[PDB]
Amino acid sequence: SSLTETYGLWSINCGIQEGKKVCFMHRQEVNDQNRVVVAMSVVLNADGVVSGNLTVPFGILVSKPVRLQVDEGKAVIETGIRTCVPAGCIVPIVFDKNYVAALRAGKHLKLAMTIAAPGEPPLNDLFVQLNGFSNALNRLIALQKE
Amino acid sequence: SLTETYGLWSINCGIQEGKKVCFMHRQEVNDQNRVVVAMSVVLNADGVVSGNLTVPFGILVSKPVRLQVDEGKAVIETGIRTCVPAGCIVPIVFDKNYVAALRAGKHLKLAMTIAAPGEPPLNDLFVQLNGFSNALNRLIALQKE
Amino acid sequence: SLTETYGLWSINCGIQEGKKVCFMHRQEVNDQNRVVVAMSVVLNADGVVSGNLTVPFGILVSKPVRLQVDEGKAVIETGIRTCVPAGCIVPIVFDKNYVAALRAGKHLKLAMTIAAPGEPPLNDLFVQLNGFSNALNRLIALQKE
Amino acid sequence: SLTETYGLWSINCGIQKKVCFMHRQEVNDQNRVVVAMSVVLNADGVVSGNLTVPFGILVSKPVRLQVDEGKAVIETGIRTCVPAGCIVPIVFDKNYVAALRAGKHLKLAMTIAAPGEPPLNDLFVQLNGFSNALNRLIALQKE
Amino acid sequence: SLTETYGLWSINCGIQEGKKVCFMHRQEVNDQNRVVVAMSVVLNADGVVSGNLTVPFGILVSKPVRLQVDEGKAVIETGIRTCVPAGCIVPIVFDKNYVAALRAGKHLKLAMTIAAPGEPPLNDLFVQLNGFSNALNRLIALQKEGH
Amino acid sequence: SLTETYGLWSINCGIQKKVCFMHRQEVNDQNRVVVAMSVVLNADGVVSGNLTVPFGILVSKPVRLQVDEGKAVIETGIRTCVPAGCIVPIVFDKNYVAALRAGKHLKLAMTIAAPGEPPLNDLFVQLNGFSNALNRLIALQKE
Amino acid sequence: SLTETYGLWSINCGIQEGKKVCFMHRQEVNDQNRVVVAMSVVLNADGVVSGNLTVPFGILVSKPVRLQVDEGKAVIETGIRTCVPAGCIVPIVFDKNYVAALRAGKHLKLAMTIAAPGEPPLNDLFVQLNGFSNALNRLIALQKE
Amino acid sequence: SLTETYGLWSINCGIQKVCFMHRQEVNDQNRVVVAMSVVLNADGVVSGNLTVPFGILVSKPVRLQVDEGKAVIETGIRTCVPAGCIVPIVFDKNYVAALRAGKHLKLAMTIAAPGEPPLNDLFVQLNGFSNALNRLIALQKE
């Protein structure tokens, strides 16, 4: 019986996949037409590392990296698309202790990528809102101890 | 009848049987976005806080529904009164001490028994309490109006 | 799993829970042709007739559901175990004497309490017993098969 | 055009030239929109926009805007009505903006076009997140 | 409540608060056959003709709605009272002289202001008056059947 | 673009430059358009436009237009067909326009593309209101 | 085969059992734009004006349907023959004098009895006669063709 | 308002409790062609309504006969509604007794068509009539 918890703008669900109880932390961003443009889903691993997946739009140049930055600060991750599914293109993400700390203090997780189009234009206006990240992560830590 | 929002809690006022009445409410949903548990609450003239908690179908009606604020000592044991198409209705009355625990709490944890072979417990349901205190303050303010 | 018809009563057999279990059932409808009350019954190996009665929503769960064959002295008092989307489930067990009354009866009258202000009775609900005896005879015959 | 959220307030940026707006809808228990408010920051620094009110409002009589029970009172009127409802243009000075940031509700008062001309006073816009959303509008101007 | 037809004008009667009330009405449509302007009118006990004009959405409510029978001197200036899903409602009262102009007229021309940047005029809207006189005569006759 | 009505004829104006046209549709007992006529007033006073006739008309044989029983008669043909039907361009001189004003019906005569090539002579356009509608088109040109 | 319009009246011609028959018709609607009353009329081979009036359901079939041109002495009394999904059918035959009254009239007034407790009259229904004379002239002209 | 079943006949009760006895007959396409609804009155008389098809000649009577016996009633259509044409029926003590012992209630009427043909193949099935009427008597005493 998988009840959704809400911490600011972030949601938490605990579910059974491949016979395992796993609790995940998630957020969707929508446009003015209320359709999902970017999504992020995150788990707390046993060693304390925060990892999961970022869902980005179709039409992104797969050979060029996806850049992740907390606001305009010094926390920069560069990763890439692993595969795309009907929901969009999947970008695996692993956050170290330092990046997690920046995520808790930040407001926006800014994304930067390249469009697969003539001229190869950048797409830099996408982000994930971080309001409630810290509290939702604290709950994920608390659910591990349970 | 405009909806007021205080954290996760909502307030609606309606004119029932001549007089005005204002209620405080919250719904919890699953990952499929369907309502699993609901809570609706009013303020009475004597000062007590009471209302109804809506729980799922398939709950063993003869065994009680246990309400606990987080992991504290505020424990209420009550039962299902009836079930309607929306689910099974659990009447709830909170004393001054329990109300104070609700204001300071994060989760109102629910414990009940499933009517199934083996009679398994259902303990993972809750009502989130973010905004309870501010919504209850508004209910107090609306009584004076 | 072909449906057999004995008067107003129906019989279906299935593999349920591994074993081939045959059940005896009847639904009652209103003028809008929606189900208000249902009854499903099995014959156990001991010769004891048991099963479930489905009653409407909004019934006071803490007070009992009374079962009476017509106006006779065959009176059973039982209660709601749980409620599901189809309605509220009342388990029923009939002894040899009650079974004999069901065979000779016309109506199985139901009496319950509505969960409403004042707690009014609901006494106009019944299960029609036309074909009960013959359907039970078939259930006995299917046990020997 | 990604939607930003600040408390109960939303921010969307579009094109008309780039223009970012700040908006909030209020619903009833039947979950339909009764009142809406949309707001922009102007190049000089004045906060303005539109309030959408229900149909059946007496158009000749003004719409009164008040932050809680304070001294910040604006009186304005319906400009026109469209299928979404009746449009009330609003301009907020520096002092009213400051009251909006500190306030909880923006209370609305208007007259119903009905026999007797009854008042409609129970409508409001919730101000939780107004200040943070306005700060973001200021920040988007500098960008 | 059977609909009577007099030229382009319609008549429907209904019982309002015990008394039989008959109204005179006309709607105008565009090329997509949707209603842009409507007019509904009753004959009052003292001989005055009053009712409502329905105009489109997007009209500047602070500026008046001007009513003119063709190009003559029968000019009324009034305003929008409210707007509903059907459009914006303009109450109208016609005196004996304006009623006489309506009977002899072909078009009731409307003039209003659009609530848009620049505040442009909307002057191409009208109510066609073919059958007005005969429908009003029927309205007079239906009053006498009352009393 | 409000529709004016003159008897059985309609007038609509629009931008293409304000162009006003005069039109009439004829329907059968099932209420489906069988024949249509649309007409404009040109700058030099000539009246021209299009007639819409049914499908299944022999395109190589002419469409004859006659006002009632008179002998001032126009011969023309189908230019093309569209989903709405087959389009017949029409130009009326001053004398034919005067006949249209005094007439009751504009009778149509054509040939069906079928074995035996049978005539279709029972189709018409009703002319009640033509004169008054054309007067309005003249008045709209001066405006 | 074109619909012709004469005031409020319509004319359609259609082939029935070999040769073409032309009929004269009118529907009356309410404010909800649904048909309450309809009239269809033909000229027979020897020049008799006859046809059918369609009236609402709920009319007392044993009591007559009275037809009157305005407030004149042209009065016909007839009855319902049958009812179909479209409503109740009243056959009508007009003599030379009644035809002449129809030509000069504005309304053909209908009077009937409602099949209801108390048996109330229904007198507010009519057929509008604007264009009747011109449409009848066209029926005469179509006979000669 | 629970439906009781007695053979082919149904019983439903309203509240004032006014109880009625009813039966519909359908064709092979499962559409209702004829219906009958009946109440028991305080003076022991059985009355109600018969619903017949559209297209029946209203000026000619509707004949009701229990099988091939002497119980013959002649009545007419009062009005027609969207459900069909309504024929009011009143049964005396002797006709009621015939209804209890009968199998079919045969209907005879005239079609409003050229030639005015008869319609004689319609009926109401009477299996369960007696038991349903007994229940109506029992519900009056309650």
Next chain:
Amino acid sequence: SLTETYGLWSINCGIQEGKKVCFMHRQEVNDQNRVVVAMSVVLNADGVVSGNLTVPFGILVSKPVRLQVDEGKAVIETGIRTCVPAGCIVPIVFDKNYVAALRAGKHLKLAMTIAAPGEPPLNDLFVQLNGFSNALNRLIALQKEG
């Protein structure tokens, strides 16, 4: 063409292309209320009862369909003639002795072979005979009328 009801059996009379025929019929359904087996029967002028049994798809056509009234001596063996969208059609002819068994019986039991690997039997299908006798009496009565 009004439907008559005799117990579980129905009677309809129809004009099927220049022929006025009254038939006696019964459908059996499962718990999902879909038709599994059907029987339609006419009375011949010489007293013989004949008609059609409709059985499911997937029945081995080369092996017979066995008909038995309860557990008595009345046994008919026949076969599928054809199949249509409604199912597989089995023609049936009942003699005077079988008709008498049908009147006194409760079930008409069916036995057939499934066209599947192993060729398994299907023996749980039946037609309920409640009202057969009364419906057949009505068919006799309708012959004297027509």
Next chain:
Amino acid sequence: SLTETYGLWSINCGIQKVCFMHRQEVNDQNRVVVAMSVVLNADGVVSGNLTVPFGILVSKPVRLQVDEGKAVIETGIRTCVPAGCIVPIVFDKNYVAALRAGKHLKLAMTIAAPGEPPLNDLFVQLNGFSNALNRLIALQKE
């Protein structure tokens, strides 16, 4: 009435027993732009109908050419129906022989539009024409 397939061409037979030879051409949206239906007549003549789009200038001819060769027919629209505009076609022995050896039957027509532009990019594909026509000859002997 089973459909036979010969390359890109189809054959259907039926009563009106007449057998016809047909082909449809579609665009990238998979909607029919042009169609051709053909019969073998009793006198040995190959004829039928070409269906072209709406908006074609009816007073100007439709030109038919097998590839870029000498076989040129000039005909016109007879009428238009909801399916499109109908062009009747009769083929002589020489044109039939060109159709058998050809790849495309090219179409040329005029659009009824300001300026009267040509429409020259429409065609009927001829793969299987000869085998389908052989079958039509064989069906005549049957």
Next chain:
Amino acid sequence: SLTETYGLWSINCGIQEGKKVCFMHRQEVNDQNRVVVAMSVVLNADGVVSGNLTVPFGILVSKPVRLQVDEGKAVIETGIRTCVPAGCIVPIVFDKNYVAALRAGKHLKLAMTIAAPGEPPLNDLFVQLNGFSNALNRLIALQKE
């Protein structure tokens, strides 16, 4: 399971009894684009060609289905085994000589009897053989893989 196309014939492969089984198939449609006849065929390990023919409903099951390649002396007589919602199933086994005729043929002609009064023949149904040889060559090639 990607569809391969050889003329008018199609090839699909799937897993069945954990071996990979590949089948050769063709459907014929009418002018209404609905399937009237279908044929599905496998190459067996011993080099023999077998499978199923799907024929319409309403075929007399007691009388045989005759299969003939054009006008030659390749004639097989077989029958319906069963019918399913898709139609009536006719099992078919082709020997080396019949396979060779199938390769060189144009049409596989079917002859059967309709279950109707008079028992009329149905002789106008066929399976088109364009691409049979190449599709069978591919089936041989897929066996070696």
Next chain:
Amino acid sequence: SLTETYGLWSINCGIQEGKKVCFMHRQEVNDQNRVVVAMSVVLNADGVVSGNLTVPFGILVSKPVRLQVDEGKAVIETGIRTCVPAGCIVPIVFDKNYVAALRAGKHLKLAMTIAAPGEPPLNDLFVQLNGFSNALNRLIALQKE
């Protein structure tokens, strides 16, 4: 923009940026008739054939897509550039030698890696080459026009 057909291959022409562009395309479907793989190709100025291959979702983007004509030695290795709602797009460029192999080939075999635990291969996908040569000849002929 009329569709030409050459065996299994299709040709469509458009006008992009005031220029005649004609493309050569083929879709492959499964037994459920949905598109699993697509190929679209243009003839460049230098006689080199280039375009796009559309592959399914769920393919490991970091690992290459291998293209091979039959069991021959013509092997291209390329990768996914992006994915769209229609699937994942693989740009392809064929040299004179590969074009010649495509002309003589039957299948263009595809090999790729699934983005799944274990990273399994997907090797059963192909594009059928029947009509490639004739469609390419037409593309050459359309360039000269």
